[PDB]
Amino acid sequence: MSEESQAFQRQLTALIGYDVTDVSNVHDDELEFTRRGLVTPRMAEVASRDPKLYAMHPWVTSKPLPEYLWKKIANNCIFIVIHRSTTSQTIKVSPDDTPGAILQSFFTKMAEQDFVLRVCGRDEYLVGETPIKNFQWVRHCLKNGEEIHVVLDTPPDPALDEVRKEECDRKFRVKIRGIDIPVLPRNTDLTVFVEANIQHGQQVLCQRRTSPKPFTEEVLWNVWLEFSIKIKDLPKGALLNLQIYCLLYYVNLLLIDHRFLLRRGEYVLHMWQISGFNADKLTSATNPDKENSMSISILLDNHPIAEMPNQLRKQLEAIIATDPLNPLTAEDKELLWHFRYESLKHPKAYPKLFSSVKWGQQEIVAKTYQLLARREVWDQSALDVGLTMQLLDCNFSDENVRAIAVQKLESLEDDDVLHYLLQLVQAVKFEPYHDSALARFLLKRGLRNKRIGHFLFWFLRSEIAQSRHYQQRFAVILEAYLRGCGTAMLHDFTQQVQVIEMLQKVTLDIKSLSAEKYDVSSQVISQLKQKLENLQNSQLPESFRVPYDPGLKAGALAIEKCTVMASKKKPLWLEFKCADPTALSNETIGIIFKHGDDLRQDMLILQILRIMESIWETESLDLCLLPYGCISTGDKIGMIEIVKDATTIAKIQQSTVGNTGAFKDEVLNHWLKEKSPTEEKFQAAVERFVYSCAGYCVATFVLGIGDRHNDNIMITETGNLFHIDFGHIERVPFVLTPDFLFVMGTSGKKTSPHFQKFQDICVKAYLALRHHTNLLIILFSMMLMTGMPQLTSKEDIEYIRDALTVGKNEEDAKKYFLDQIEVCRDKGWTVQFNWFLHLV
Ligand SMILES: CC(C)n1ncnc1-c1cn2c(n1)-c1cc([S@@](=O)C3CCN(C(C)(C)C)CC3)ccc1OCC2
């Protein structure tokens, strides 16, 4: 390659955090094969995008204006404050007017046609053939009662986005030679054996075991494990799962490679160790640490192409109506399979139908592909996100089954792709092969829209930086995106990466300078300021896009306002000046850098919270959640958005009584009244407290994270309650302590108007979520599988079934949640005290 070609690859390696040209941990060429394969999908999307619209990336929805936003429009009139340098003029606009129309009514209101409306202080453009009511920034201002402020400037030049040009009927058997680990402690007396499983979509097609032997550094067997399944019956995507029991170690091997070739020859596989079921157990990558890991040595030596009776119908309809977690009896599977063509008429049956396929039989697999040829009902069906996500989880390894799921995602608009982007990225872990329709879909949508591409960058990079199991696959996908996003975005990502990596280093250096066991000294703060002083000059980039808020550009550090938080983790509290002079306020941009909690769990929770917001929006319900920004950037390290004018509920308590323990009921209401500028703003804060407390009580109860220490609950000075710090997990279903009830005017068995409103809001929000039970269940199970240490498959996932009271009518569901509110009233301060004791 050319000299600049090598320098460009080094540029990509720095952005990715991993060298895709490094081949220290591969036993085939699938990764390089995938790099070539993703060239055509990338270039096809680069060729299809409009240069002007890609440069301005308008954030737009097609959903109707919610009712709670329509009543916020007084006279079918929306006010836009248009700025031109130091001047400003207010314009009345119809909710259906387009940006081009309101631009015309602006110049006409005077008495060259190449200007653009941009949000003041943000890289957010109000352009395109779209009603102004369908811009997300307009709806954000409507919901929060902010004035729509816009500047009149020049569109960004699409030339900046330039992309650089490219340049056997025999039974299956495996020989288990032995296992090897370099060092083993002298002590104890341990036995060990090897379990060999043929797996497809977590179905165990066949299983064989070796004999148990004493556990030494080298254990040898030299046995043939002969299975009953024939070679010609091995489905594509099937895994040879090898596991050592004393479960201690595991490793997987694709029996059919990316070229439809049966795996053959000698293999020395370095295995993963179980830390003292989940997505990591499905990876075909081997342990990169080949010096100290357990290895297993095997030998492979063994090509593809190329009406119901009314009572049985009732049983089938009952099977289809059950939740995605309901286990399928063998009788149920034979029912779904034999009445194949009736099951095809029910889109919600497809997950259970394909779980009834005998994937270990080639003739049955062929019958399944014949079934999917007549796909009229599925192609015409309305897009069901939850249904589609079921077909992309760990239970389906067939490429054609997963392909028809990705086909349905193609109709998602950019607004909804952003809602599910994080989950779709995680679902790549469930793909048997590196190059898949799901991976190409993500690549496609990220290249089509700069906001999707921005979050796709940081979602992929988060896994690359800390997931040994999937960093190789995600790095090839990220490289494919970076080679098509354009020069301007490559420049932006470079500025962001250099900033976060410099701040990551400062974060780790500060935490080693202090201890959780002790308090924050002026010494530790002085160390921080000196380190930031060295970064600032020199050299910190002049500005960078905020990773969790790409519309915001942060400038220089305000070092005088930077400090180390008094928490146990000693996270950094950083504040940056805003680099956009057209901004309305001189407010700083606050960013928290924290080590070390798994912020990937925070990411998953906050994204589900935003999904619950969209669910409630479709029912004209506003619950006033506050899903702040949060992005994991490495192993137990990442960044968090600073919400202004907010404090923790524990700090409000301790402001009065101080490092106990003995919580008081009236302190929260006193705090809200003190922080309220007027009585009118105070009453609005209490109203916002009622809604947000109900929204979080319902949301945290469904997700099973309701029992929280009030140090992890925050409140804004404008009354917005919100939970924080999810990288963690007598009892309570949620937090509804006497201080919360006092704000609502209630104190121990005394129903107040605000508390009755809280009860009615909770029930309505709860019933609204139950109409999306299957969606919430699939998001919940996927979250445990891709974000948690280890997941019990059949029980941990079972909690949300009872929480969503599956199978009960709305009356029993309503009483169920009202009883949960009563448990909190009966428990009082008890559970909070036990949490405080747990943290003394
Ligand atoms: C608690 C922290 C471990 N954590 N862990 C995970 N997630 C979080 C988190 C998330 N958020 C916050 N924390 C947050 C905290 C505070 S207060 O703690 C802060 C108030 C300001 N003071 C100064 C001005 C420096 C004296 C210090 C204490 C204020 C605003 C916040 O933004 C909302 C999102």
Side-chain angles (χ1 to χ4, degrees), residues 35 72 101 134 198 207 341 517 521 676 744 775 823 826:
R35 299 180 64 203
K72 211 255 179 171
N134 287 3
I198 309 295
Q207 175 184 82
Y341 291 86
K517 224 199 332 274
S521 56
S676 295
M744 309 180 189
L775 207 219
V823 173
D826 299 333

Side-chain angles (χ1 to χ4, degrees), residues 93 101 124 136 148 234 242 267 298 322 338 389 417 492 514 560 587 627 641 681 711:
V93 165
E124 202 66 75
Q136 251 311 133
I148 304 174
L234 293 172
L242 302 169
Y267 288 93
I298 68 177
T322 60
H338 186 261
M389 305 264 252
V417 170
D492 280 352
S514 179
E560 296 84 352
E587 272 190 316
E641 171 182 3
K681 285 197 174 185
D711 196 23

Side-chain angles (χ1 to χ4, degrees), residues 563 573 592 594 640-643 646 651 714 722 724-725:
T563 189
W573 176 279
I592 287 175
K594 184 183 67 167
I640 304 169
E641 171 182 3
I642 287 182
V643 172
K651 284 188 184 67
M714 300 197 60
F722 64 101
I724 65 172
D725 204 355

